[PDB]
Amino acid sequence: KPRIDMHSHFFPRISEQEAAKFDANHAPWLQVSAKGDTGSIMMGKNNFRPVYQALWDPAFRIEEMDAQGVDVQVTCATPVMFGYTWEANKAAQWAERMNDFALEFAAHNPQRIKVLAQVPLQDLDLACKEASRAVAAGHLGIQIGNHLGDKDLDDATLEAFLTHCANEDIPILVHPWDMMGGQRMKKWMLPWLVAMPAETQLAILSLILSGAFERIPKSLKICFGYGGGSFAFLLGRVDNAWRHRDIVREDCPRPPSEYVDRFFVDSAVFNPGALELLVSVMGEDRVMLGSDYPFPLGEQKIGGLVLSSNLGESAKDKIISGNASKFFNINV
Amino acid sequence: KPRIDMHSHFFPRISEQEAAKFDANHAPWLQVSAKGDTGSIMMGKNNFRPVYQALWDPAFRIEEMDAQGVDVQVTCATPVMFGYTWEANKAAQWAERMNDFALEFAAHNPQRIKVLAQVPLQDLDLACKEASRAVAAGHLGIQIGNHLGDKDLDDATLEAFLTHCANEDIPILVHPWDMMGGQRMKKWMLPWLVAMPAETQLAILSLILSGAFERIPKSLKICFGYGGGSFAFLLGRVDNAWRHRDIVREDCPRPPSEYVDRFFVDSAVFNPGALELLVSVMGEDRVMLGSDYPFPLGEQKIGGLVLSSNLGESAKDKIISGNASKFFNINV
Ligand SMILES: [Fe+3]
Ligand SMILES: [Fe+3]
């Protein structure tokens, strides 16, 4: 039964001078070492993130895919690539480049590497153009940040985007980015451990409590990275809020727990017990295998947590294969 | 078999005339209505927060305890009473009276209503003796906000504040306030559902990943509110990042999950699976029973979630009674 990892990232071959053509210092580019096994993602003239070959080089990535026993990998842009804050034409031009770079990457092996597209999400019209064009060009769906500055997914622009994709049977993966906190989580990767889960939970709850799921067609295929943050665990607090205060219930007609059937989440939660609570809340039909490859905080043995757990026979195949197969309509 | 609820709040009988002796601009005061069953917390002249009798009336509170099954109850100040932004000598006096009004509330019935004190935490020195006075005065411990502005618990002054408390054996309850978010979480009580649990997790992670537990004595008795937020669910992700990045690891010599035997959490998690995970992570000797009385979002039937769960009879006694009895020094 072919293992599918749906959460993985790539970054293309962009030079410093090319990035500068979009933005002096907000546009990302890749610095590769001369040997070319290691390198670093660069913000203007500034070190952003240390990385290795599997991120840019498809040939290298394929061996590591064999090594982990991963047949098909659905990879997407690095959240830093989004450029949601720039001028729309510059960001729309950017997204066409990146999504093409992505097809170029997967040309190496169409059968085993699948790509998701990015969109200039600050401008609804250019975003809908890109979403459609890129799926036409071969992408299996779209990856978007969880918020545009102070605009959460409850915002009419982000709804109208999701409504678009639902109507065109385009699947969406939502990745947290540009985390809250300001000047509080500077040390020990706290952004990744505190805010990122809260960001994702806020994404989920923005749709639930705003009554977004009532307005959006039930045919939308939407997924949340990293086990939907800390949603599942705090769900009971949400339901309690919903029942005992009216301002929590105004725009939401059903108990918030009833909306678990309207979205998906991936398996990356790094704990046996958290995974078992996840499947208790989400159901075996709504969890997919994501690893966050090939970043240091991604599950280093892909499928490790799932394959070693004590869940259904059917359920295990579902999470590692069955669910991701329908969701992205990959040829099984 | 004595039920102890250790997470509850009060507000005192403060006339604006006694409020103005400190401030008529930020210093909050109590407005008792017609009947005398609804009241209001006023911010000098305007309406901050409306509440019902149970918050300010001890006599009424006793009766609702009697109806609820609660035999002993530990109550602490409401977050708006903290004024950690105020001048160190203003707050040192303001806090002294707030803990006096506290003790006046507890005076009615000391056997059953116990009190915890607030401090001018923005000044270590002023806050330190204030704790000692209040404990010598009748309070069983102290209550602090999780963070002071951009200063989290990884801060030396705070760490020293906790070290003062460990030394002089004063137990602490940490309560999230003034939530992160900026201009984002506006409708549906999102600050209280997303930000709040994230604050508490951060407070816990701040001590663990900084290595603060390597310096603070094992004798510190410190509790985190609301089940430690999303800590227990996300602990696996923190262990995984520790294992895979050197910056996460640098100031924390043991794995993060090792430190769960250094603090306590309350049981306000509103979900039976969340609770069993919480106990699985922390242990039955480290969980205490909290309701967050009398706020609407606090548990309706105090203890309901514990008593209707799959835990050891032995285990339910420790949560309901045992642990709170050792932790606070309450004659059963
Ligand atoms: Fe990722
Ligand atoms: Fe509280």
Q: Where exactly are the structural domains of chain B?
A: 1-332
Q: Give me the residue label for tokens 């869940």.
A: A311
Phi, psi at A214, each rounded to 5°: -65, -40
Residue A319 half-sphere exposure toward CB, CA atoms < 13 A: 31
**Cβ contacts of residue A143 below 8 Å, gap of 6+?**
A76, A77, A116, A117, A118, A172, A173, A174, A175
- β pairing state of B4-10 and B72-77: parallel
- Of 3.40.1160.10, 1.10.1740.10, 3.20.20.140, 1.10.630.10, which CATH number belongs to B1-332? 3.20.20.140
Distance CA A306, CA A287 (A): 11
From the CA of A298, the nearest ligand is 1
Q: Do A248 and B280 touch (CB under 8 A)?
A: no
- The burial of B30, by beta-carbon neighbours within 10 Å (0-12 exposed, 13-18 middle, 19 or more buried), is given as buried
Identify from A52, A158, A233, A238 which residue to disrupt to test chain B contact, counting B C-beta atoms within 10 A and taking the largest count: A233
- The burial of A17, by beta-carbon neighbours within 10 Å (0-12 exposed, 13-18 middle, 19 or more buried), is given as exposed
Q: Apex CA B136: angle with CA B134 and CA B141, to 5°? A: 55
- The burial of B313, by beta-carbon neighbours within 10 Å (0-12 exposed, 13-18 middle, 19 or more buried), is given as exposed
**Cβ contacts of residue A186 below 8 Å, gap of 6+?**
none
Breaks in chain B (C to N > 2.5 A) come right after: none
Q: Do B281 and A273 touch (CB under 8 A)?
A: yes
| Per-residue DSSP letter, B300 | S
| Strand (E) or helix (H) holding A235 | helix A231-244
- Kindly state the tokens that stand for B103: 């003790």
Identify from A201, A209, A226, A237 which residue to disrupt to test chain B contact, counting B C-beta atoms within 10 A and taking the largest count: A237
| Strand (E) or helix (H) holding A281 | helix A272-282
From the CA of A80, the nearest ligand is 1
Resolution in A: 2.8
Q: Do B180 and A183 touch (CB under 8 A)?
A: no
* B127 contacts B121 by C-beta, under 8 angstroms: yes
Identify from A51, A147, A188 which residue to disrupt to test chain B contact, counting B C-beta atoms within 10 A and taking the largest count: A188
**What is the whole-number distance in angstroms between the Cα of residue B314 and the centre of ligand 1?**
43
| Strand (E) or helix (H) holding A195 | none
* A306 contacts A319 by C-beta, under 8 angstroms: yes
Separation in Å, CA B261 to CA B114, B147, B318: 26, 22, 15
Q: Which residues of B touch A274 (CB under 8 A)?
A: 233-234, 236, 277
Distance CA A52, CA A295 (A): 9
Q: Do B188 and A252 touch (CB under 8 A)?
A: yes
Q: Apex CA B314: angle with CA B309 and CA B317, to 5°? A: 75
* A195 contacts A180 by C-beta, under 8 angstroms: yes
| Per-residue DSSP letter, A270 | S
Binding residues of B for Zn(2+): 7, 9, 175, 292
From the CA of B225, the nearest ligand is 2
Q: Which residues of A touch B154 (CB under 8 A)?
A: 187
Separation in Å, CA A300 to CA A65, A290, B193: 12, 11, 32
Q: Which residues pair with B10 in a beta bridge?
A: B77
Distance CA B133, CA B136 (A): 5
Question: Sign (positive/negative) of CA torsion A150, A156, A157, A162?
Answer: positive
Distance CA B295, CA B78 (A): 11
- Kindly state the tokens that stand for B276: 């069993």
**What is the whole-number distance in angstroms between the Cα of residue A175 and the centre of ligand 1?**
7
3-state class (DSSP) for residue B7? strand
* A253 contacts A211 by C-beta, under 8 angstroms: yes
Q: Technique behind this structure? A: X-ray
- Kindly state the tokens that stand for A164: 């678009």
Distance CA A187, CA B241 (A): 13
Closest-approach residue (CA) in chain B for A208: B188
Distance CA A119, CA A114 (A): 17
Q: Do B194 and A205 touch (CB under 8 A)?
A: yes
**Cβ contacts of residue A77 below 8 Å, gap of 6+?**
A9, A10, A11, A98, A102, A116, A118, A143
Residue from the list B180, B197, B235 with its beta carbon closest to the beta carbon of A181: B180
3-state class (DSSP) for residue A79? helix
From the CA of B80, the nearest ligand is 2
* B207 contacts B154 by C-beta, under 8 angstroms: yes
Neighbours of ion ligand 2 (CB under 5 A): B 292
For A223-247, give one letter per residue: b (16+ CB within 10 A) or e. Answer: bbbbbbbbbbbbbbbbbbbbeebee
* A122 contacts A74 by C-beta, under 8 angstroms: no
Single-letter amino acid, residue B141: G
Distance CA A204, CA B190 (A): 11
Distance CA A137, CA A141 (A): 11
**What is the whole-number distance in angstroms between the Cα of residue B228 and the centre of ligand 2?**
12
Closest-approach residue (CA) in chain B for A189: B248
Q: Closest by alpha carbon to B118, among B177, B163, B196, B65?
A: B177
Binding residues of B: 7, 9, 175, 292
3-state class (DSSP) for residue A77? strand
**Alpha helices per DSSP H over chain B:** 16-20, 58-68, 88-108, 124-137, 156-167, 190, 196-210, 231-244, 246-249, 272-282, 304-307, 313-317, 323-328
Distance CA B214, CA B259 (A): 10
Residue A163 half-sphere exposure toward CB, CA atoms < 13 A: 14
**Cβ contacts of residue B21 below 8 Å, gap of 6+?**
none
**What is the whole-number distance in angstroms between the Cα of residue A10 and the centre of ligand 1?**
10
**What is the whole-number distance in angstroms between the Cα of residue A220 and the centre of ligand 2?**
38
Separation in Å, CA B315 to CA B135, B266, B304, B318: 30, 14, 15, 5
* A305 contacts A273 by C-beta, under 8 angstroms: no
Q: Do B237 and A296 touch (CB under 8 A)?
A: no
